Design an enzyme around this catalytic site. Structure first.
Site, short mmCIF file in Angstrom:
data_model
loop_
_atom_site.label_atom_id
_atom_site.label_comp_id
_atom_site.label_asym_id
_atom_site.label_seq_id
_atom_site.Cartn_x
_atom_site.Cartn_y
_atom_site.Cartn_z
N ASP E 40 16.37 2.04 64.57
CA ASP E 40 15.46 1.15 65.46
C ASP E 40 16.06 1.27 66.94
OD1 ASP E 40 16.86 -0.88 62.99
OD2 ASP E 40 14.86 0.02 62.86
C1 LIG Z 1 25.58 -14.98 76.25
C2 LIG Z 1 24.48 -14.74 75.04
C3 LIG Z 1 23.78 -15.82 74.80
C4 LIG Z 1 22.74 -15.87 73.83
C5 LIG Z 1 21.63 -14.65 74.00
C6 LIG Z 1 21.04 -14.06 73.13
C7 LIG Z 1 19.45 -14.13 72.93
C8 LIG Z 1 19.04 -14.91 71.79
C9 LIG Z 1 18.59 -13.94 70.64
C10 LIG Z 1 17.28 -13.86 70.21
C11 LIG Z 1 16.40 -13.32 71.19
C12 LIG Z 1 14.75 -13.51 71.05
O1 LIG Z 1 14.61 -14.14 70.36
S1 LIG Z 1 14.04 -12.30 71.77
C13 LIG Z 1 12.44 -12.08 70.35
C14 LIG Z 1 12.71 -10.76 69.66
N1 LIG Z 1 11.65 -10.40 69.01
C15 LIG Z 1 10.67 -9.83 69.31
O2 LIG Z 1 10.41 -9.26 70.29
C16 LIG Z 1 9.37 -9.74 68.44
C17 LIG Z 1 9.09 -8.44 67.93
N2 LIG Z 1 9.55 -7.17 68.59
C18 LIG Z 1 9.45 -6.15 68.31
O3 LIG Z 1 8.85 -5.35 67.88
C19 LIG Z 1 11.06 -5.39 67.76
O4 LIG Z 1 11.48 -5.58 66.59
C20 LIG Z 1 12.17 -5.50 68.89
C21 LIG Z 1 12.94 -6.81 68.51
C22 LIG Z 1 11.49 -5.68 70.32
C23 LIG Z 1 13.24 -4.63 68.48
O5 LIG Z 1 12.45 -3.26 68.36
P1 LIG Z 1 13.05 -2.46 67.12
O6 LIG Z 1 12.63 -3.04 65.57
O7 LIG Z 1 12.44 -0.82 67.51
O8 LIG Z 1 14.69 -2.16 67.47
#
Ligand SMILES: CCCCCCCCCCCC(=O)SCCNC(=O)CCNC(=O)[C@H](O)C(C)(C)COP(=O)(O)O
Lengths: 76, 80, 109, 28, 83, 51, 247, 168, 48, 74, 70, 251
Positions: E40
């Site tokens: 991924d």
């Molecule tokens: C100091 C830090 C403090 C905390 C910060 C942390 C931030 C919070 C954590 C969560 C963030 C979210 O919700 S951000 C939301 C994340 N999810 C999405 O974007 C929905 C679907 N996305 C996709 O198509 C992929 O699964 C993708 C994820 C892009 C990856 O691609 P790969 O599958 O190819 O790796």
């Protein structure tokens, strides 16, 4: 770098490596020592030590102003 | 404890005004030993120990005088 | 297309936020072994939200992600010394090219 | 080696007051 | 001194071989992390971060997200004179 | 030095190791020496003029 | 600019010392809070305007106003230190500000711009100018050892013996004058070059270095041994202070 | 001998600053270290004669600002407090000159660094040895200057330039 | 190091088990044995 | 160093002159509390009144508390 | 490529000219009226009275009446 | 007396820091160090001497002056004296913490550093090591050797250089009338700081999680990291006020 080789400066610029730096360093040594000689003579002439030391000290060799300001009600 | 070193002896010894107390007569030998020995700590232990004991004796005396005075502050409160 | 570019742009936002949140995790942990446990935990959240397909609820998770990073960010992050903001940045840098030095300027003739 | 090998600047970098030296044997 | 492309090539591949979902084989200096290896994109940024620590570099977040193949990770480190 | 998988560590210069150990050993001894000479004094057990 | 700042500016303060102060002693006492207020405002306000100027010659011009109003505080203190210090600062300013206008002109004759934003990094191409510019920058900050510190401190001495409030407001120029002089020097000389604006450079030539020599000698000579000047002044200064009183 | 204590670091800085193009990195390093170290040795002798020997030294070169009762003077005072600070300043500076000799070896601009080190030392000596408030003020401002010059010694770095201005 | 993220970084940190880079707390007090030994020899010496 | 940015947008005022995570007035409140710790500690020192529990009497120096030695009338 | 004169920037020069021509922008607004009143009138009067009061407090320290000032 | 003592161990601590930094390719962040005691034995040894002397470990240079100041502050029976004693005493706990926190992070914890730095390490050359050894000897013996000279009871070393009026003299009472527990507070406080530093930097593993989840604890971390937001308040309220005045008002 490239253009700094065409730039004159008193401290020599970057990575200054004069070829005769040893004879220039030794010539610089002599100048300071020659400069120091009148300074030391004037210092010895100017120092004032109103108190005799508890033991003989190196400045009694060249300084003749030991125990002189005893008469303070005469200073002007 | 009565004053020994006269005013002239302290002035001639050039003692700091804060050390012209009852133990001044012992400070004079101590400081003459200290200057002659370049103030090294393993020297003049004898003159230093004598003079420190006198200064300890003085502070205990004033501590005991207050120990008394403090026992009369409560007397006034216990009878008020 | 447009849904590709719009979703692909959303992809970049997530990948960078993971990159930044993963490095800031090492700032708070210092020790390597504490960083292993904390990195695994941070990954698991990005995985919990990876199933969402509502393009709009994603834009909302991403914005909530940036707010979380900007809030819980380490006040003193680590910087490689030669990198921007580092302790060695712009120290004894190489001379720029294109510099010319003129001799015999301002003569009476 | 910085104390036992002489330097490389046969002549100093730049010119004093940025004036090119005169022709050999000539005076400014 | 500078580091030879061969020295880079050995080291960057060594970085991706350690990845658990990545078995020791099928890692040539040309493979793409998400395609041939089948990882991924989040898996790729951790590889980019391990490549960062391996050569002690600070890649800007923009350039870091573009690196998606070992060929892109090699050419970046080689170009970088502080690796 | 010794190489363990890519990362190589060079052994320190011998006189660096000798001086380091020696200076701290001189320090540890001077501490034990002093603590036995005027340790009861700072603990309040006895006084310098006691004798 | 050299003539305007170094000589013409001195004519108002000279006129205060030659005509108003001795000829009208009673009125001078009455207007002393008025002069103190105007000078104090000019020192504080114009120093802050100088901070926000972006033209090389504007920063130097505005600095001249604050220095001249400190002179007026000294002369209206009406004592040996205040009037003695006021004359020394007048002379020092005519050397320091003149030298500073010469530094900016050196830069302008070559590159034809007065905007600070274009310059910067000049220490790597004109180290001789940068060293001379730094010295007159320090003299403009009234650094002890420079000619301007002698007049400045003497005026503050004379002001403190009359009104401690005006001497306090006038001493604020030590902080403000330092801020704009070093900010000017660093933005022009320090940092990195900007080859998109300037790429061709020449340090000082033989005529420009010689021009700066009597300014360095004069500034050092007054800064370390002002006695050669004060000795020739004190008799005239003393009688100016005593003019109009007989006790 | 007491004037050689104060003015030797000035001589060392003067040679490195004005004549560093003839000495280079190695020559300017030796020049400034030797003068400061010699002044350090004389300072040890001055501690022995003034503090251990109980003999204070008073030295008056010339007046600085003489205006009516105002009497700032180029004058030096060497008592027990002075020679304690002389020892601290000269000894630590001599070591820092020796330390910098190899610490700044790879720096392009070592001679200017050694020159600034010695000029700081001279001003600090002028601060602890003065017999009046104005000479102390000259030392006070001089060490403010030398610190500014040394904080932004890497003039290309913007944080150093921000820090040096804030210090001053 | 349970999750794939943690397992990666421990695998890359596997050089940190260097012999003379780890177990540094046994070097915390250099010269401790020699100083004590000299104090022992001195303490016996002071008895006579 | 590398390539100085040449402006491409009309320069605004306050550009000659142009602390990230904590707001302006929130920082003033936190610093005010920190300085309020010294204020409360100082008040606690007054409330303690250590001067009233001195365990010795004020030093007395001989010769009228060294009146002559301190510059008084001889 | 040619000459020592600076390569002019149109945006930087525009910033320069807009600074020199500020007097054409004065409008007599509410903010300006407050600023001119406070720092053009009120503050100098405060400094004037502070300086006079400083003299007067000296007069009553010397057992003298309050000295008159214009 | 504390001034001259301070000039020895502090200079030893900065010059020793520089050697670590020079050795580690100009790295200065302690979070990317650790496991350097065996790689740099000379430097660590000088840092231990300087640190132990700075924190006031018994019979070192720092012990003969730091402890006397804390004793004299207790003896000052004034509101400001009581203020100083409380604040000076608690700081001893705090200085011992960061002194040992530095050591553990820099040289004793398992390495937190980059490989390319470790494989390019070297220790002090002779002109750098010579001042460090001379300052170690100073930061171990100067304090004992110079006490009776400087603050010996009734000493005449200062002659007329310093003045203490009779009514203000407290040295004798500070050395004799003080309870024995008072003279042991700094060592008891220093020991607590060393032990706390060992626990936070060698054991605790969920401690940082308090700040990454709690708003008050996170601001508190930034409060002490950003120096009580002093620069901020003074920039947002003082420097910016004067800068804005010189354009919007006076100009
Ligand atoms: C100091 C830090 C403090 C905390 C910060 C942390 C931030 C919070 C954590 C969560 C963030 C979210 O919700 S951000 C939301 C994340 N999810 C999405 O974007 C929905 C679907 N996305 C996709 O198509 C992929 O699964 C993708 C994820 C892009 C990856 O691609 P790969 O599958 O190819 O790796």
């Amino acid at each position: 770098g490239d253009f700094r080789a065409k730039v004159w400066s008193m401290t020599g610029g970057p990575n200054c490596r004069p070829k005769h730096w040893r004879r220039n360093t030794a010539i610089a040594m002599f100048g300071v020592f020659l400069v120091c000689i009148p300074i030391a003579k004037l210092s010895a002439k100017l120092e004032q030590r109103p108190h005799m030391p508890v033991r003989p000290i190196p400045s009694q060799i060249w300084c003749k102003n030991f125990g002189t300001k005893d008469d303070y009600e005469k200073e002007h | 404890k009565k004053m020994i070193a006269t005013q002239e002896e302290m002035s001639a010894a050039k003692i700091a005004l804060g050390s012209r107390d009852m133990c001044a007569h012992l400070l004079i030998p101590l400081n003459k030993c200290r200057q002659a020995e370049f103030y090294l700590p393993w020297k003049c232990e004898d003159e230093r120990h004598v003079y420190e004991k006198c200064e300890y004796e003085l502070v205990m005396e004033r501590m005991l005088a207050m120990k008394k005075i403090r026992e009369e502050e409560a007397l006034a409160k216990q009878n008020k | 297309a447009a849904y590709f570019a719009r979703r692909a742009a959303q992809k970049e936002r997530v990948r960078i936020l993971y990159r930044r949140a993963l490095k800031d995790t090492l700032n708070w942990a210092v020790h390597r072994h504490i960083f292993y446990r904390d990195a695994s935990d941070l990954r698991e959240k990005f995985n919990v939200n990876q199933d969402v397909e509502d393009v709009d609820r994603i834009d909302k998770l991403i914005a909530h992600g940036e707010a979380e990073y900007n809030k819980w960010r380490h006040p003193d992050p680590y910087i490689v010394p030669w990198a921007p903001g580092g302790s060695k940045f712009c120290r004894n840098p190489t001379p720029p090219a294109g510099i010319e030095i003129v001799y015999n300027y301002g003569l009476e003739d | 080696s910085r104390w036992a090998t002489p330097g490389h600047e046969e002549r100093p970098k730049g010119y004093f007051m940025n004036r090119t030296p005169p022709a050999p044997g000539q005076s400014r | 001194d500078h580091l030879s492309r061969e020295a880079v090539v050995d080291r960057v591949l060594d970085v991706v071989k350690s990845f658990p979902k990545v078995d020791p084989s099928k890692v040539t200096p040309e493979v793409h992390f998400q395609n041939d290896l089948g990882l991924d994109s989040l898996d790729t940024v951790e590889i980019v971060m391990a490549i960062e620590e391996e050569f002690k570099l600070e890649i800007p977040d923009k350039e870091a997200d573009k690196i998606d193949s070992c060929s892109l990770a090699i050419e970046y480190v080689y170009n970088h004179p502080m690796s | 030095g010794i190489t363990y998988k890519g990362v190589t560590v060079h052994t320190p210069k011998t006189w660096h190791t000798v001086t380091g150990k020696g200076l701290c050993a001189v320090m540890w001894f001077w501490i034990l020496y002093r603590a036995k000479q005027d340790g009861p004094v700072v603990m309040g057990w006895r006084h310098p003029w006691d004798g | 600019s050299v003539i305007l700042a170094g000589i013409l500016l001195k004519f108002g303060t000279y006129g205060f010392l030659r005509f108003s102060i001795p000829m009208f002693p009673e009125a001078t006492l009455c207007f002393t809070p008025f002069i103190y207020t105007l000078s104090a405002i000019a020192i504080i306000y114009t120093s802050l305007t100088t901070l926000r100027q972006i033209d090389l010659k504007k920063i130097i011009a505005y600095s001249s106003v604050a220095h001249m109003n400190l002179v007026t505080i000294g002369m209206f203190s009406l004592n040996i230190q205040g009037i003695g210090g006021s004359i020394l600062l007048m002379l020092s300013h005519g050397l320091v500000s003149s030298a500073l206008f010469l530094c900016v002109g050196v830069l302008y004759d070559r590159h034809k711009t007065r905007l600070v934003r274009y310059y910067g990094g000049l220490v790597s191409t004109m180290p001789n100018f940068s060293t001379i510019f730094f010295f007159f920058t320090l003299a403009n900050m009234s650094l002890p050892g420079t000619s301007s510190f002698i007049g400045e401190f003497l005026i503050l001495v004379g002001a403190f013996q009359r009104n401690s409030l005006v001497a306090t407001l006038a001493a604020l120029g030590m902080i403000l004058g330092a801020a704009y002089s070093l900010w000017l020097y660093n933005r022009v000389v320090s940092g990195n070059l900007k080859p998109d604006f300037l790429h061709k450079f020449s340090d000082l030539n033989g005529r420009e270095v010689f021009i700066f020599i009597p300014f360095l000698v004069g500034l050092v000579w007054m800064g370390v041994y002002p006695k050669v000047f004060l000795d020739c002044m004190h008799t005239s200064v003393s009688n100016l202070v005593q003019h109009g009183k007989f006790h | 001998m007491y004037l050689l204590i104060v003015f030797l670091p000035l001589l060392g800085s003067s040679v490195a600053g004005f004549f560093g193009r003839f000495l280079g990195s190695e020559g300017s390093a030796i020049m400034t270290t030797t003068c400061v170290s010699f002044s350090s040795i004389l300072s040890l002798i001055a501690f022995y004669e003034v503090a251990l020997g109980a003999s204070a030294c008073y030295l008056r070169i010339a007046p600085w600002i003489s205006s009516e009762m105002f009497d700032a003077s180029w004058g030096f005072l060497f008592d027990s407090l002075t020679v304690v600070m002389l020892i601290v300043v000269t000894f630590i500076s001599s070591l820092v000159h020796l330390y910098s000799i190899s610490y700044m070896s790879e720096d392009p601009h070592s001679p200017r660094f050694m020159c600034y080190l010695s000029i700081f030392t001279f001003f600090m000596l002028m601060l602890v040895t003065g017999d009046n408030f104005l000479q102390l003020f000259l030392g006070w401002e001089g060490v403010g200057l030398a610190s500014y010059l040394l904080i932004h010694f890497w003039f290309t770095r913007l944080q150093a330039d921000k820090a040096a201005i804030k210090a001053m | 190091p349970l999750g794939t993220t943690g397992e990666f970084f421990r695998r890359r940190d596997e050089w940190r088990k260097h012999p003379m880079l780890s177990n540094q707390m046994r070097h915390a007090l250099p010269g401790i044995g020699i100083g004590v030994g000299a104090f022992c020899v001195y303490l016996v010496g002071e008895q006579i | 160093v590398g390539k100085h940015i040449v402006p491409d947008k009309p320069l605004s005022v306050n550009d000659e002159l142009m602390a990230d995570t904590v707001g302006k007035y929130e920082a003033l409140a936190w610093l005010s509390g920190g300085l309020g710790f010294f204020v409360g500690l100082g008040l606690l020192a007054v409330l303690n009144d250590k001067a009233s529990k001195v365990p010795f009497t004020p030093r007395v120096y001989p010769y009228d508390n060294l009146r002559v030695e301190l510059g008084g009338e001889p | 490529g040619g000459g020592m004169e600076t390569n002019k920037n149109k945006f930087i020069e525009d910033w320069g000219s807009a600074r020199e021509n500020l007097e054409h922008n004065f409008r007599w607004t509410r903010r300006n009226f407050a600023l001119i009143g406070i720092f053009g009138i009120a503050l100098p009067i405060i400094v004037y009275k502070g300086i006079v009061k400083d003299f007067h407090m000296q007069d009553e320290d010397a057992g003298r009446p309050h000295r008159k000032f214009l | 007396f504390h001034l001259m003592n301070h000039a020895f161990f502090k200079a030893l601590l900065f010059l020793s820091a520089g050697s670590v930094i020079h050795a580690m390719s100009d790295e200065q962040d302690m979070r990317k160090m650790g496991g350097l005691a065996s790689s740099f034995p000379l430097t660590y040894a000088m840092m231990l001497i300087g640190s132990l002397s700075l924190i006031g470990f018994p019979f070192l240079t720092g012990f003969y002056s730091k402890d006397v100041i804390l004793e004299l502050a207790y003896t000052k029976y004034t509101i400001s004296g009581n203020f100083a004693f409380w604040l000076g005493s608690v700081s001893v706990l705090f200085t011992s913490y960061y002194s040992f926190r530095l050591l553990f992070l820099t040289f004793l914890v398992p390495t937190n550093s980059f490989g390319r730095d470790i494989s390019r390490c070297h220790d002090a050359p002779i002109p750098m090591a010579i001042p460090l050894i001379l300052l170690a000897l100073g930061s171990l013996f100067v304090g004992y050797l110079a006490k009776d000279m400087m603050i010996g009871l009734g000493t005449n070393f200062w002659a007329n250089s310093l003045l203490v009026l009779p009514k203000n003299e407290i040295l004798a009472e500070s050395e004799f009338a003080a309870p024995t527990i008072i003279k042991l507070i700094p060592i008891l406080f220093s020991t607590l700081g060393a032990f706390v530093a060992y626990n936070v930097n060698l054991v605790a593993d969920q401690f940082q999680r308090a700040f990454q989840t709690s708003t008050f604890c996170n601001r508190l971390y930034s409060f002490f990291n950003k120096r009580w937001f002093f620069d901020q308040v003074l920039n947002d309220f003082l420097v910016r006020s004067f800068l804005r005045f010189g354009y919007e008002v006076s100009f």
